[PDB]
Amino acid sequence: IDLGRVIGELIDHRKLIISITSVFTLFAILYALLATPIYETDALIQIEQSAPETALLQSRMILGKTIDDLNLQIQIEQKYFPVIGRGLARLMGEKPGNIDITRLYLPDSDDISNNTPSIILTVKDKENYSINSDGIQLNGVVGTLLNEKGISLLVNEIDAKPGDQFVITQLPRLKAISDLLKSFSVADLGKDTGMLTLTLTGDNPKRISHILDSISQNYLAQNIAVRIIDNAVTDPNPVRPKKTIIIVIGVVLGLIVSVVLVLFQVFLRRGIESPEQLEEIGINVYASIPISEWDTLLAVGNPADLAVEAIRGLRTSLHFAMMEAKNNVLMISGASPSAGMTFISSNLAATIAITGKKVLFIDADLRKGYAHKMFGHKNDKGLSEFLSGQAAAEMIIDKVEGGGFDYIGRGQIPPNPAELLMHPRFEQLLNWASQNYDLIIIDTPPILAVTDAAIIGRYAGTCLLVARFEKNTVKEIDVSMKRFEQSGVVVKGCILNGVVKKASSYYRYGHNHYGYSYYDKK
Amino acid sequence: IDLGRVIGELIDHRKLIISITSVFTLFAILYALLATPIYETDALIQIEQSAPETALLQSRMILGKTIDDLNLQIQIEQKYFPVIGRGLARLMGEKPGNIDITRLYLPDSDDISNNTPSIILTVKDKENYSINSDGIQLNGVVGTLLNEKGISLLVNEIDAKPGDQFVITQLPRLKAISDLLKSFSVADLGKDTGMLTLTLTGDNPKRISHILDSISQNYLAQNIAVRIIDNAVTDPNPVRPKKTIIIVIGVVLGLIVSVVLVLFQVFLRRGIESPEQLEEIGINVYASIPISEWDTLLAVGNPADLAVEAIRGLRTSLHFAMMEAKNNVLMISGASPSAGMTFISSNLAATIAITGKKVLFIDADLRKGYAHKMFGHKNDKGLSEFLSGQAAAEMIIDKVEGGGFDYIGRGQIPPNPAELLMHPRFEQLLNWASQNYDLIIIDTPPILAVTDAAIIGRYAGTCLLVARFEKNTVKEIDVSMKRFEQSGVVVKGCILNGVVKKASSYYRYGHNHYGYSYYDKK
Amino acid sequence: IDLGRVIGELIDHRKLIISITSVFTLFAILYALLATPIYETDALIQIEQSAPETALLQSRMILGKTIDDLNLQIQIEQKYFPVIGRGLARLMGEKPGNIDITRLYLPDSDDISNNTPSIILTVKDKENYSINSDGIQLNGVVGTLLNEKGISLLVNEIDAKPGDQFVITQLPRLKAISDLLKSFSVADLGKDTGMLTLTLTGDNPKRISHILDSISQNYLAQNIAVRIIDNAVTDPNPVRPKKTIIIVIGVVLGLIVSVVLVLFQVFLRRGIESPEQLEEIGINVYASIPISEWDTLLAVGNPADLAVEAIRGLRTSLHFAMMEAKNNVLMISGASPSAGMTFISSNLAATIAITGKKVLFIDADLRKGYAHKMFGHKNDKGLSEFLSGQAAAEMIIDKVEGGGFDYIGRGQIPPNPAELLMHPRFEQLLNWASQNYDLIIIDTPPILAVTDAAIIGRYAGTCLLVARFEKNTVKEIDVSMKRFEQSGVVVKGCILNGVVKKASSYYRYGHNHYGYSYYDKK
């Protein structure tokens, strides 16, 4: 692989790459805008050492005094049902509702796991409120304390709108200490100075400054039984989430994921990429039919289609290739199902019939042939009925309206399709057809599925394989040709079908084999 | 090997990989959820150095005082018969039963090895209990102490349900010290500060906090004859087992074990992977029969089977390959036993007999031929009886009901099978059969087992080998062909049997050689 | 690639390289000249340690005293609508207007986000001024304080011109401290000395010296309740923007961007670079027509053109190449549209007609042929009308005035162009034309677009392909020739059209294939 190859692959997979990168960036931006902002407050303490003082500041004695003074064991959180309800409410300009509680004694369930009892407070108005611990409803008012059902609660100064719910947890003293200790850090900043930098993170900018002031003052009173230089102030710019580094990572992560997925699809695909791959093995490619964007025949409904023009090129190439053959019978056989053989063979018959030639189309796919459905069908007396002996040759030939050629349907699906084609009536039909027509085109099932095409190929003077652009493999075509040759059927060449324009073909090889549209635009 | 090869191997062995990875993850999750949770309590001590104080804290003098104060030599464990009975009981929400014992004097067996005497206490109710040391049953009550059979026991406040057994061990003082010392650790956390961080691990969160408080207080009283800043509190989140790192290791370990086992099976397998391996040595492969999911013949019970369609392809390939031969006798010989020769040869005779040809099936496997059992048999007068001279040719030919062809059974297993086939009656049978039939198909034993096929191959105009997909080796086929050629029998080609769809074949080679199913689904 | 190749590529892409480098340097110079200059003032303090004194200097206590003394919370900025209005005003010699404010109390909106209220002061004259916070207009005079609409303002000594607007923000105390702290740095400069180097950056050289003097004096008074050696003086040379390193980076960045863009265009282009690329595949190139700087024919309006001289070379090469051919019919077919086939074929007919030969020009591009428009047309009865049978051969032949040869127009665009060319009237026309003319030149559509040229090529004794210099690929030509050969049309060779002089061709190959102009300049 070279620079041209990888750049062509990027150009071809640009849509997948952009989609993956864009969804990654969207997730990164949604995270950076919905994650709760965490502020950081700092303070400065003058020590008259400071290494044992650092461990004393983070001790449960100093921090425990802060939990008790500020009631940090009363956890109050705004209620939001999703994991994004808090982020989007902040985006919508909704100010976070807050309630002040000074006394909270829950019945202390203290079960196997839930050591943190919780209730749900629903704001009814500015004054009164409701409480539901486990469905037990209790109505309370600011001021008057509540002592009912083993639940003591004192809510002061409800600052919110009616309908706001609040999860009120009474976490144990050690947990409240452990939460404060996890967000509280102490540094020396000079490693020799008597200066300690107390920092505290949290989602509430005002609350974390009151806590850090309490920690500094409780440590101050404890030491005198030291100087506070800078009291705790909260940085108004949140330190997390760091939006820029999250979005940039979302871009880089989306890009590298896109590349490795594209790099795998390039290294794992085995389908045909160009007619050159077939010609490298010695397989003559007579036409490359591009994908048509469009029950009528394409060569009649849209004669100017880019696919029909490539079929006209096949017509002229076949005319020079079909001379010096045994007979005027041309067999067309896809290598795999859904290769587009009936698309090519029926439109090829149309492009040759308009040239004034008498063409007979034989849908000899007794298993899955649908040429009768496509042309309009008196489905009785098809090819099956003729091979079985219950129909004459003149009774199975029909004319296509949007055609120009005669066509023979497969008939009713026989139980022994391969055995019917071996009947001598089949060769007698082709010998009779070879005298009343200029060209006989025969659709056959794929040789890698059944052997029907090998039997029919014995009576055809020219045999062509139909390969799908990306669905069929080069070796798949080579096995198909060798299977025909093993049964005495020489394949004249292959027809690549369903070619799509790709930039990687333009850089790996010097051509894309898609075809130029050519008309005066009017 | 390339990326395509390894990815195809992963796709083919995905079931083994997923099974191994899933059982590894299941074991890891069962360990992470059944291992007893171990909590960690910590304390803070202020030293006014601290390096000799660390060694004094872990001394048997300080720790020995703790063992005596809290009776740590009385080991009490809830009784569970399996290694998982404690884990699952905790999962089921069953609270662990605990009993308080203050006096435990066992008869002190002190034998060669068991220096730790043990008894089994069975809770009968809230008040009384039972005791069985070595089968000697003793009934005791909370309160009143027990002095019987040299066993002193004082159980206080039994907190459990009736039926809970308890193993009560009286371990020596040094062992109790060694157990505490193993879970007790001392650190300085500043390497200069007078701060010591005493930590203690254990399965009981309340007990380890009482022990660490005792250690701190016994060290405190001993030093004043120092300040305890933070008393021992237990972290409610267990430090072990670390579930996430155990499960993630279970995933990674299952994956790497799956890969190396798959990597060995890929590097150790020698069987045929595709018909290309045979054709690389110059062995013509006339058909690749896929594995049929299905005593009737497959070509009659299910004519539309994917295996029968590949046999129809063999029929058309054989017709073109059998012309220009000496006679109409086709010999089919597997390279190894259970290669599927009789599956192919009997179904091939059916697919050719429906074409209106007279086919004779000769089961010339006088050792293990079971064609008579498969078709319905008048087992008397088979091929053996004819070669021995006790049966006429017209008396050994039988007709298959679900057939269409005539068949000759092997007969009774002769003592000299190879010698019977050398009798001139065998060639006279084939010369007679060659005049009353269009094709004679002969089953023969594998040439690498016996020489019966080499003898029969002298009279057959066409000889084909049947190879099993993965069971037979390429060289195994090459040795079989060369052994025939060494005896004057030229093998026309090979028939690969039992092909299964594999993604690795699609990436190593450009084709899988399995065959496309082709029918209108109705 | 070698030194010659890369140097030739640089010479050929010199215009793109110079343009990119020049726009990069222009942006860098505009940045270096429009970015606001930032001055740096420094002071020297003598400490009698200095490590805790450094942290005390940057404390909010010392810096907060400076904000209050100098009213640093009153932010005054000259109003400029663009991001360059301040830079260019400084370039134009306009001195920055400044107003002195001592009292600023805004109504303190304090909404969700905007914690910094702002107003807009518009200077009306030396004495009075106007104020608009949110559209509310207020008129004030220097001296007399304003207390209206909850806005307290005291503006002293307006030094500006009437019309100058000023954004007056009252930022919070912490923000003003954070802005000063961000630009204030303290260093020791000896790491042991009692010398502290206080430095302060800012856009106002006089203001930053007053602030740093305040910081030094507030720290001096605070410490005595230390020696100031060097009072704060501002370096008159701004420390930023560093113009030289910005411009030099603009040069280097423009160069490396130019190189990588040129390096990609060289590695991504696949078009033909020289006639040697075609001859390496075995394609005979009979002429290389250079780009002509110029509805008349080029070979008549400017016979001395460099393109016409190369066509005269094609004429002499064709004369030697067209002998020993079946007939005197020459077909010319571009490989892709807009290849210049009609430019070459019509001018080639002119250069051969002046030699006294009778030439017939057949515009057989029934889809997009415009030869009739170029020569002057009685558009009725073209080639289409003749093939359809509604026009005689003698009625479709016309004479070109600026010609010398006869020409046949395409006629009205037929619905079946490819089918009309297959009519036997086409060969009868050429057989008749071959007897009344010395050479017949036939324009045809590109073979990679439609098959019209393959049909016409069957009756032409010589067939040539027209390749565009850079638009067509070598493989594109090779596919075109093989498609003709697949239809029984042998292409005699190719004609490279639109060649442009390039230095890289002179270094990769030994020639540029552009052609030397040759005339006596008079």
Author numbering:
A (entry chain H), B (entry chain G), C (entry chain A): 17 to 64, 85 to 261, 409 to 477, 494 to 721
Paper lines:
The tyrosine autokinase domain forms the cytoplasm region, while the periplasmic region contains small folded motifs and helical bundles. Autophosphorylation of the tyrosine-rich C-terminus of Wzc results in disassembly of the octamer into multiply phosphorylated monomers. We propose that the cycling between phosphorylated monomer and dephosphorylated octamer regulates glycan polymerization and translocation.
Previous work showed that mutation of K540 in the Walker box abrogated Wzc phosphorylation. In contrast to phosphorylated and enzymatically-dephosphorylated protein, purified non-phosphorylated WzcK540M was homogeneous, oligomeric (based on molecular mass in gel filtration) and yielded discrete octameric particles in negatively-stained EM images. Although the data were processed in C1, much of the structure displayed eightfold symmetry and the application of C8 symmetry improved the resolution to 2.30 Å. The WzcK540M octamer is ~165 Å high (cytosol to periplasm) and 146 Å wide and possesses a large central cavity with side portals that open to the membrane bilayer. The transmembrane region of each Wzc monomer comprises two helices (α2 K31 to L50 and α12 I428 to F447), which form an X-like arrangement with multiple side-chain interactions between them. The conserved tyrosine-rich region (Tyr 708, 713, 715 and 717) reaches into the active site of the neighbouring subunit with Y717 positioned at the active site. Y715 sits in a pocket, where it makes a hydrogen bond with E675 from the neighbouring subunit site. Approximately two-thirds of the surface area buried by the formation of octamer occurs in the cytosolic region, with the remainder arising from contacts between motif 1 of the periplasmic domain. The interaction between the C-terminal tyrosine-rich tail and the kinase active site of each neighbouring subunit buries around 440 Å2 surface area (of total 1200 Å2 buried).
